[PDB]
C-alpha cells in the first residue's frame, strides 16, 4: 500500500487502497506462507515470466491471490459509456503493471480485470475501480421517453465487490485488535 | 491487450466528437411547423428529464 502511495508516472494519482480478502481480516482458515517455485517441477513459456503445470508431475501447490481494491483520483475525462469504461480500466491495469516492474522490480501480470503482483513471496490481486461506474450501470432509458435510475444485478454486484466488501474487511480487522480470540473462533466456525 | 484498448478508444472518441459537432450545428435552428428543441447547450438552464427531478 505504501508502494502504491507514492508511485509516479500514473496519469491519475492513487486516492484509496483497501483490502477485500479474508486474510487481511484474520479470518482465513489456513494462513498462507511465502513460496518459491521449483524450476524443474514446471515447464516455462519463455515469452512471459509465467510457469505452467506439467502433465506428468502431480498438481502444483495452491496459491490464492488476495484482492486489493484501488481507487484513483477523481476526474471528468472518463467515458460516459459502460463498455468504454471497461477499456480505460484495462489500460490502467497495463500501465500499473508496467510502472511497478520498472520502479521496484516486481513480477507483474496484467489482466483485463486485475493485476497480479508478487512481493515477498505473496501474490496480490490489484483491482482498479471507478467511482461513478455503478451509477452508469443503473441508467435505463424507458420506452415512453424518460431515463431513470434502477438497481441492476450487475450494478449491485459491482457495489458489493468494490465498496461494501472493503468496509467489512476493515471493520473486522479493527475488531480483532480489541479481541485477539476472534480469529480463532471465526476460523474454527468455517472449518 | 494494449492494441485493442487503443483501437476501441480511438473509435469511441471519433463517435463522440461527431455527435458533439452535429449537436452544435443543430442548436437553435427552428425547423418546419415551428418547433425548437430544448437542449442543455443553451444559456438558460433547463429541467432535466429524470425521475429524481420530476419527484423533487
Amino acid at each position: 500500500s505504501r508502494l502504491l502511495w507514492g508511485l509516479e508516472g500514473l496519469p491519475l494519482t492513487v486516492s484509496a487502497v483497501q483490502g477485500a480478502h479474508p486474510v487481511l481480516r484474520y479470518t482465513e482458515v489456513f494462513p498462507p506462507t511465502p513460496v518459491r517455485p521449483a524450476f524443474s517441477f514446471y515447464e516455462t513459456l519463455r515469452e512471459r515470466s509465467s510457469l505452467l503445470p506439467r502433465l506428468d508431475k502431480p498438481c502444483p501447490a495452491y496459491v490464492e491471490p488476495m484482492t486489493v481494491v484501488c481507487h484513483l483520483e477523481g476526474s471528468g475525462q472518463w467515458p460516459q459509456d459502460a463498455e468504454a469504461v471497461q477499456r480505460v480500466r484495462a489500460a490502467f491495469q497495463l500501465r500499473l503493471a508496467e510502472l511497478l516492474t520498472q520502479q521496484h522490480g516486481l513480477q507483474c501480470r496484467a489482466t483485463a480485470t486485475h493485476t497480479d503482483v508478487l512481493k515477498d513471496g505473496f501474490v496480490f490481486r490489484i483491482r482498479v475501480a471507478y467511482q461513478r461506474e455503478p451509477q452508469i450501470l443503473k441508467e435505463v432509458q424507458s420506452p415512453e421517453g424518460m431515463i431513470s435510475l434502477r438497481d441492476t444485478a450487475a450494478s449491485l454486484r459491482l457495489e458489493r465487490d468494490t465498496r461494501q466488501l472493503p468496509l467489512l474487511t476493515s471493520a473486522l480487522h479493527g475488531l480483532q485488535q480489541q479481541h485477539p480470540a476472534f480469529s480463532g473462533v471465526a476460523r474454527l466456525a468455517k472449518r | 491487450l494494449r492494441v485493442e484498448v487503443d483501437t476501441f478508444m480511438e473509435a469511441y472518441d471519433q463517435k463522440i466528437a461527431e455527435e458533439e459537432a452535429k449537436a452544435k450545428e443543430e442548436e437553435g435552428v427552428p425547423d418546419e411547423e415551428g418547433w425548437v428543441k430544448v437542449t442543455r447547450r443553451g444559456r438558460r438552464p433547463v429541467l432535466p428529464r429524470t425521475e429524481a427531478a420530476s419527484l423533487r
Binding site: 496519469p11 475525462q77 477499456r87 480505460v88 490502467f92 | 478508444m9
Partner: peptide, 13 residues
C-alpha cells in the same frame, strides 16, 4: 491608435 478603435491515458494527464 487607429487600429485600437477598430495515448488513451494522455487526456487524464
Amino acid at each position: 491608435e487607429q487600429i485600437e478603435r477598430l495515448s488513451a491515458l494522455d487526456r487524464f494527464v
